[PDB]
Amino acid sequence: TSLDEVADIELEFEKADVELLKHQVELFNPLYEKRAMVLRKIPKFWPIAIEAAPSDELSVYISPEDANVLEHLIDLRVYRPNEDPRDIKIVFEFEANEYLESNSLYLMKLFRYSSQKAEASSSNINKEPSQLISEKVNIEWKKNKDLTRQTKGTAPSFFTWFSWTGKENDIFEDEEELAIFIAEDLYPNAVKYFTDALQE
Amino acid sequence: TTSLDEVADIELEFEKADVELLKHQVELFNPLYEKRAMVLRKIPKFWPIAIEAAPSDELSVYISPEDANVLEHLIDLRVYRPNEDPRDIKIVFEFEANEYLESNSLYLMKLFRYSSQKAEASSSNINKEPSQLISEKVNIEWKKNKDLTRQTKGTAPSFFTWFSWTGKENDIFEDEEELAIFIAEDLYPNAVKYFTDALQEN
Ligand SMILES: [Ca+2]
Ligand SMILES: [Ca+2]
Ligand SMILES: [Ca+2]
Ligand SMILES: [Ca+2]
Ligand SMILES: [Ca+2]
Numbered sequence: 001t002s003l004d005e006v007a008d009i010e011l012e013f014e015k016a017d018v019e020l021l022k023h024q025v026e027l028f029n030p031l032y033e034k035r036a037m038v039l040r041k042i043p044k045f046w047p048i049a050i051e052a053a054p055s056d057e058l059s060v061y062i063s064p065e066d067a068n069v070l071e072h073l074i075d076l077r078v079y080r081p082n083e084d085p086r087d088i089k090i091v092f093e094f095e096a097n098e099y100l101e102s103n104s105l106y107l108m109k110l111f112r113y114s115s116q117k118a119e120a121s122s123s124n125i126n127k128e129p130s131q132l133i134s135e136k137v138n139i140e141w142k143k144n145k146d147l148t149r150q151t152k153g154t155a156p157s158f159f160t161w162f163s164w165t166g167k168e169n170d171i172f173e174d175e176e177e178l179a180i181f182i183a184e185d186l187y188p189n190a191v192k193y194f195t196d197a198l199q200e
Numbered sequence: 201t202t203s204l205d206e207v208a209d210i211e212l213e214f215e216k217a218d219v220e221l222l223k224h225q226v227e228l229f230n231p232l233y234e235k236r237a238m239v240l241r242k243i244p245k246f247w248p249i250a251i252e253a254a255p256s257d258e259l260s261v262y263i264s265p266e267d268a269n270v271l272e273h274l275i276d277l278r279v280y281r282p283n284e285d286p287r288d289i290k291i292v293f294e295f296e297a298n299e300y301l302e303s304n305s306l307y308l309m310k311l312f313r314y315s316s317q318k319a320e321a322s323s324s325n326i327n328k329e330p331s332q333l334i335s336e337k338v339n340i341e342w343k344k345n346k347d348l349t350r351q352t353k354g355t356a357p358s359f360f361t362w363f364s365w366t367g368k369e370n371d372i373f374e375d376e377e378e379l380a381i382f383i384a385e386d387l388y389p390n391a392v393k394y395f396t397d398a399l400q401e402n
Contacts, residue, residue, distance in 0.1 A: 005239050009232065010392050016228050023224055027217055035210045041203045054328050122397065126386065127255055189326050191211050196324040 021085040032187075036077060039190075046073045049190045052197035057181045061174070063155040065099075065147055070158075072097040078187040086113035088132075088183045099147065101140040109137045109162055111179050123171060132176045137162040222286035237278060240391070247274040250391045253398035258382050262375070266348055267359040273298040279388040287314035289333075289384045300348070302341040310338045310363055312380050318367070331367075333377050338363040 039045050047070050075093035092107040094100055111132040121130035139162055147157040164175040240246050248271050251259060276294035293308040295301055312333040322331035340363055348358040365376040
């Protein structure tokens with residue numbers, strides 16, 4: 001009987017959580033926009049910030065030649081553009097380079113919050129979250145230069161992340177955690193990581 | 201470059217916005233937390249059950265068998281943000297009478313204050329080894345031969361030494377602040393989810 005009540009109260013919490021996120025989005029959207037314009041003026045800001053971010057959340061998924069592509073990353077943006085603020089849109093923008101084709105210099109991936117999937121899950125949302133789905137983002141690599149190719153001897157690539165959908169039965173992955181890390185840690189804290197790299 | 205100067209300016213805007221956001225969070229959730237607490241107090245052993253169900257590596261690992269005996273009598277846990285700076289956190293443990301705590305130590309309230317200067321020596325340690333909080337020792341009176349926090353040789357490690365932590369020592373090698381933040385930002389807001397999970401696994 002008290003479990004009933006507890007259940008109802010928890011629904012308001014969930015409701016309040018989404019409202020808070022909505023306010024966050026409205027509040028920080030102009031700031032991120034302002035910050036974006038300055039950061040674009042700072043050469044190699046993003047590859048530096050990525051490298052300085054916690055190893056076990058990011059760099060561990062990044063190979064030397066992955067880093068070579070990422071050295072040409074001139075912009076990183078994260079948006080919460082939809083009615084559900086839990087949807088996250090991540091944008092990578094590269095300058096022309098030896099690895100990517102010009103048609104693939106602007107890479108956008110959308111992660112949608114999936115109520116059905118989130119309810120279905122039993123795992124701790126901070127440990128192994130199971131809530132997001134996405135569509136494949138195609139990348140065309142220049143000849144000889146495809147880092148995501150599935151052949152023997154080829155280093156595992158950061159860039160396979162872009163093909164992730166979250167639609168399989170797979171509680172054993174890191175792609176959703178990476179998305180959340182980029183959205184909720186790397187992007188907001190990017191200047192702090194960059195600043196740390198600079199001190200030595 | 202001039203660019204790095206602008207970045208510093210913007211960062212300050214972010215920190216202000218982040219504090220403003222938190223104040224909104226406090227006004228929005230405080231009434232919900234009060235209502236929830238009322239209902240939790242009539243669910244027997246809610247808190248020790250939610251604690252046991254919390255991630256092992258965040259809480260359980262610091263709790264000894266004897267610690268768990270004390271925690272079995274935890275009837276209320278509250279977290280507040282009562283100061284002008286919403287980053288200050290006040291954590292309240294309320295126990296029923298038991299064989300460990302003198303009756304004058306059944307209401308244990310620990311205040312963590314956000315330290316501006318401490319935070320900016322450790323700016324990139326945001327979620328891995330935060331170093332931003334300071335606190336006052338919380339005195340606990342234990343019944344005779346029941347002081348789990350004794351520093352006698354051979355004495356098993358105890359969760360309850362957490363209450364004496366201050367964060368004013370030169371010590372970047374700690375778990376006490378991370379425990380504070382886990383309690384304030386994970387255990388307390390997600391307690392029901394933790395309790396529910398424990399109940400589906402019986
Ligand atoms: Ca997998
Ligand atoms: Ca995978
Ligand atoms: Ca994982
Ligand atoms: Ca220490
Ligand atoms: Ca630690």
